[PDB]
Amino acid sequence: PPGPPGPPGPPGPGPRPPGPPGPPGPPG
Amino acid sequence: PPGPPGPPGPPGPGPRPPGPPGPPGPPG
Amino acid sequence: PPGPPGPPGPPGPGPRPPGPPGPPGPPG
Protein backbone atom coordinates (compact mmCIF):
# COMPACT_ATOMS: atom_id res chain seq x y z
CA PRO A 1 0.00 0.00 0.00
CA PRO A 2 0.95 3.68 -0.23
CA GLY A 3 2.59 5.25 2.82
CA PRO A 4 0.71 7.56 5.20
CA PRO A 5 0.23 11.28 4.58
CA GLY A 6 3.34 13.47 4.86
CA PRO A 7 4.03 16.07 7.53
CA PRO A 8 2.14 19.34 7.71
CA GLY A 9 3.94 22.14 5.88
CA PRO A 10 5.76 24.93 7.65
CA PRO A 11 3.89 27.80 9.19
CA GLY A 12 3.20 30.75 6.92
CA PRO A 13 5.46 33.75 7.48
CA GLY A 14 3.00 39.57 8.64
CA PRO A 15 4.88 42.84 8.21
CA ARG A 16 4.41 45.80 10.52
CA PRO A 17 1.28 51.41 8.43
CA PRO A 18 2.07 54.54 10.44
CA GLY A 19 -0.76 55.82 12.59
CA PRO A 20 -2.76 58.90 11.64
CA PRO A 21 -1.28 62.35 12.20
CA GLY A 22 -1.91 63.75 15.67
CA PRO A 23 -4.36 66.57 16.42
CA PRO A 24 -3.45 70.26 16.26
CA GLY A 25 -1.85 71.70 19.37
CA PRO A 26 -3.85 73.72 21.86
CA PRO A 27 -5.53 76.99 20.85
CA GLY A 28 -3.78 80.17 21.01
CA PRO B 1 5.40 -3.29 2.76
CA PRO B 2 3.70 0.10 3.02
CA GLY B 3 5.51 2.93 1.29
CA PRO B 4 7.21 5.83 3.05
CA PRO B 5 5.47 8.85 4.51
CA GLY B 6 4.48 11.40 1.87
CA PRO B 7 6.49 14.56 1.34
CA PRO B 8 5.93 17.62 3.56
CA GLY B 9 3.01 19.87 2.67
CA PRO B 10 3.40 23.41 1.37
CA PRO B 11 3.89 26.44 3.66
CA GLY B 12 0.80 28.09 5.07
CA PRO B 13 -0.37 31.36 3.54
CA GLY B 14 0.50 36.65 7.29
CA PRO B 15 -1.31 39.92 6.62
CA ARG B 16 0.25 43.27 7.43
CA PRO B 17 -2.71 47.37 11.77
CA PRO B 18 -2.04 51.09 11.31
CA GLY B 19 -0.41 52.54 14.41
CA PRO B 20 -2.14 54.87 16.87
CA PRO B 21 -2.64 58.59 16.35
CA GLY B 22 0.46 60.78 16.66
CA PRO B 23 1.16 63.36 19.34
CA PRO B 24 -0.55 66.73 19.50
CA GLY B 25 1.16 69.58 17.66
CA PRO B 26 2.71 72.59 19.36
CA PRO B 27 0.58 75.24 21.10
CA GLY B 28 -0.99 77.88 19.04
CA PRO C 1 7.78 -4.72 -2.70
CA PRO C 2 7.65 -1.31 -0.97
CA GLY C 3 4.56 0.66 -1.86
CA PRO C 4 4.27 4.16 -3.29
CA PRO C 5 4.93 7.29 -1.28
CA GLY C 6 2.06 8.51 0.84
CA PRO C 7 0.06 11.61 -0.06
CA PRO C 8 1.67 15.01 0.39
CA GLY C 9 1.11 16.54 3.80
CA PRO C 10 -1.41 19.31 4.38
CA PRO C 11 -0.59 23.01 4.07
CA GLY C 12 0.98 24.50 7.18
CA PRO C 13 -0.94 26.88 9.43
CA GLY C 14 0.85 33.23 9.05
CA PRO C 15 -0.08 35.68 11.81
CA ARG C 16 -0.94 39.31 11.26
CA PRO C 17 2.41 44.10 14.40
CA PRO C 18 0.77 47.48 14.64
CA GLY C 19 2.58 50.37 12.98
CA PRO C 20 4.40 53.16 14.79
CA PRO C 21 2.58 56.15 16.17
CA GLY C 22 1.60 58.76 13.59
CA PRO C 23 3.41 62.02 12.96
CA PRO C 24 2.98 65.00 15.30
CA GLY C 25 -0.10 67.12 14.54
CA PRO C 26 -0.04 70.63 13.16
CA PRO C 27 0.42 73.88 15.08
CA GLY C 28 -2.46 74.82 17.23
Question: How would you describe the overall organization of this protein?
Answer:
It is classed as biosynthetic protein. The entry lists the keywords collagen, aza-amino acid, structural protein, biosynthetic protein. The assembly is trimeric. The structure is a homotrimer. The first copy, chain A, is largely without helices or strands and about 30 residues long. Helices cover about 0% and strands about 0% of the residues of chain A. Chain A has no helix or strand. Chains in contact: A-B, A-C, B-C.
* Approximate strand percentage of chain A: under 5%
Distance between the termini of chain A: 83 Å
> In which range does the helix fraction of chain A lie?
under 10%
What overall form of chain A do the CA principal axes indicate? rod-shaped
PDB class: biosynthetic protein
Keywords: collagen, aza-amino acid, structural protein, biosynthetic protein
Assembly: trimeric
Entry title: Collagen Mimetic Peptide with a Yaa-position Aza-proline
